[PDB]
């Protein structure tokens, strides 16, 4: 449970008496604890928003250099200037006029033509890929709150061999999933992928190991050279003048110089955008949203035919309060009497032991039959003073507690 009960964004959704549907909102880095009447407590959390098979739409260049700068000029009324490289699309040229005359190698004064080209090479580029609901896939983790060892589970590693933890996946074309939770029944998951986000107005952008989600219109209006899609060898760049400028032209020459790298200029424009991961051809997200419906009628308690744990418990840690007011208590059970139902409650009247508040780990059950087993619990106490009562009989455990 630990990663769920230590998270800051933890919503508490409650079921019904015998209800079968509850609504949940699943955001990244957050957990939803779903409690129900006479049902085990299950944790829901969205762990992986990932996109794949994105269509490359347009690639912009943000750093470049030139080569093979050649020029050609002709006298006034001697016709337009021409270079062999003027037709090459890998070269960028610029027509211009410059004063010529008798001391400049011509027979009549006036302005004559002049063209200067340069081979266009792009140091680094960025790519904008398109995203469609045919690319989304959400991964939700379904864990059981209180299986006597979830108090030592902190992450997803090892969830395959753990029957109390199930992993499901959701796509917009397949928004449903079902999985078994071991001896705690099974869980249903009907999710709305439309309420996730608006992924028809955005592009997935990659630039030098950094990746964002950017608006479609902001991406079109970027003033940089660009091609459509991608191509092997050398593709055709459009609007090469965004990085190449032509400076003051002498009577037979023109200085070609490139602008500085525009990487930092793009970073400053991507301050408010969402940052994303890159895993090969797949894209990974850490900022999303998910409204889902939980089918909990198939959830069940682990064995209720068990007997109450008759041996004596001992505190292993000192009870600590969580960020949500709940108390975590870790206990050690010295009994060897098989699996047994853990007697745990909160009683404001120590003589009648009438329950106040509730347990977050509903119906805790020691499943080990060896001495000195450990189990961590969680309790939602009432405000003010109340007694944590764990166990039965003489050696029962009492720890005073106050909640604001």
């Amino acid at each position, epitope marked *: 449970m630990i990663r769920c009960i230590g998270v800051s964004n933890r919503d508490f959704v409650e079921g019904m008496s015998g209800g079968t549907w509850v609504d949940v909102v699943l955001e990244h880095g957050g957990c939803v604890t779903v409690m129900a009447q006479d049902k085990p407590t299950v944790d829901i959390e969205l*762990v*992986t928003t*990932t996109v794949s098979n994105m269509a490359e739409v347009r690639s912009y260049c943000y750093e470049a250099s030139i080569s093979d700068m050649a020029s050609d000029s002709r006298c006034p009324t001697q016709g337009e200037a021409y270079l062999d490289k003027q037709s090459d699309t890998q070269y960028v040229c610029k027509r211009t006029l410059v004063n010529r005359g008798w001391g400049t190698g011509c027979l009549e004064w006036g302005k004559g033509s002049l063209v200067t080209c340069a081979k266009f090479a792009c140091s680094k580029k960025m790519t904008g890929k398109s995203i469609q609901p045919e690319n989304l896939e959400y*991964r939700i983790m379904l864990s059981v709150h209180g299986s006597q060892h979830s108090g030592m589970i902190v*992450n*997803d*590693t*090892g*969830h*395959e*061999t753990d029957e109390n933890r199930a*992993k499901v996946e959701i796509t917009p074309n397949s928004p449903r999933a079902e999985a078994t939770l071991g001896g705690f029944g099974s869980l249903g998951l009907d999710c709305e992928p439309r309420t996730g986000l608006d992924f028809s107005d955005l592009y997935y952008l990659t630039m030098n190991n950094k990746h964002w989600l950017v608006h479609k219109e902001w991406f079109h209006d970027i003033p940089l050279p660009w091609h459509a899609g991608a191509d*092997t*060898g050398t593709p055709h760049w459009n609007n090469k003048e965004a990085l190449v400028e032509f400076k003051d032209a002498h009577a037979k020459r023109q200085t070609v110089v490139v602008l500085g790298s525009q990487e930092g200029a793009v970073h400053t424009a991507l301050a408010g955008a969402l940052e994303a*991961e*890159m*895993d*090969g*051809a*797949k894209g*990974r997200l850490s900022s999303g949203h998910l409204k889902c419906r939980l089918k909990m009628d198939k959830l069940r308690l682990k064995g209720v035919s068990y007997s109450l744990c008759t041996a004596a418990f001992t505190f292993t840690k000192i009870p600590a309060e969580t960020l949500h007011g709940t108390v975590t208590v870790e206990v050690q059970y010295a009994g060897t009497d098989g699996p047994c139902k853990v007697p745990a409650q909160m009683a404001v009247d120590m003589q009648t032991l009438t329950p106040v508040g509730r347990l977050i780990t509903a119906n805790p059950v020691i499943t080990e039959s060896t001495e000195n087993s450990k189990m961590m619990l969680e309790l939602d106490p009432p405000f003010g003073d109340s007694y944590i009562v764990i166990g039965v009989g003489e050696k029962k455990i009492t720890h005073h507690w106050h909640r604001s």
Partner: antibody
């Protein structure tokens, strides 16, 4: 246009070493994790090694643990596999394979699958 | 005999539905993504099915990938004489921390 060219494999004696190479082109090599898969003549496929995009994570098959070593130079877009202390059973046609992911997450290894394969390089151990 | 086991040899008449299946454990096929590969005789392996239900662009709809329980099955509806090859399944094993292949299945 994607292509992988394996090279560096001939006939070698047991106990000695060998270094293979896989030339990558047509994709950002530094962005994708890469694998080695060998196949003995007339046998099944056997996965050998994997290296992530930044070369930080490496996993080997139990048969070659500690004896092989996968490595990569993202600058020149090449893949190296250092096989030393060989045996007669290591004779196989070795393929390098591109993985759809760069292995930059906990969920990369499960989602992993080998995207593009090379052509092979017949390594033979005779004695 | 191997981390994943598929039949060594299956044969179907041309123009008929044939299926091939490999089974593993809860650590390889149960949770992780199963992929298939077609190795035509004397050729390099060829990615056939990824994400356990999806066809790469170019593979005809004669092929189909499924996954139920801890065992994924390959599908070939309307076999043709150009499909005779060896077929391998494989995925990542989480308990072994080692990528594993299937035994292979020469189709006839």
């Amino acid at each position: 246009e994607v292509q992988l060219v394996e090279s560096g494999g001939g006939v070698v004696q047991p106990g000695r070493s060998l270094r293979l190479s896989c030339a990558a082109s047509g994709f950002t090599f530094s962005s994708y994790a890469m694998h080695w898969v060998r196949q003995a003549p007339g046998k099944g496929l056997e996965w050998v090694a994997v290296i992530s995009y930044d070369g930080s994570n490496k996993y080997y098959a139990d048969s070659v643990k500690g004896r092989f070593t996968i490595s990569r130079d993202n600058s020149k877009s090449t893949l190296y596999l250092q096989m030393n202390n060989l045996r007669a059973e290591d004779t196989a046609v070795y393929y390098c394979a591109r993985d759809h992911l760069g292995w930059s997450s906990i969920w990369s290894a499960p989602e992993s699958f080998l995207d593009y394969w090379g052509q092979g390089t017949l390594v033979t151990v005779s004695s | 005999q191997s981390v994943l086991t598929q039949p060594p040899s299956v044969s179907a008449a041309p123009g008929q539905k044939v299926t091939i299946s490999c089974s593993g454990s809860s650590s390889n096929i149960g949770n992780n993504y199963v992929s298939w590969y077609q190795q035509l005789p004397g050729t390099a392996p060829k990615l056939l099915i990824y994400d356990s239900n999806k066809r790469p662009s170019g593979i005809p709809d004669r092929f189909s990938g499924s996954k139920s329980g801890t065992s994924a099955t390959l599908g070939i509806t309307g076999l043709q004489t150009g499909d005779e090859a060896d077929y391998y399944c494989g995925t990542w094993d989480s308990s072994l921390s080692v990528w594993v292949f299937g035994g292979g299945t020469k189709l006839t």
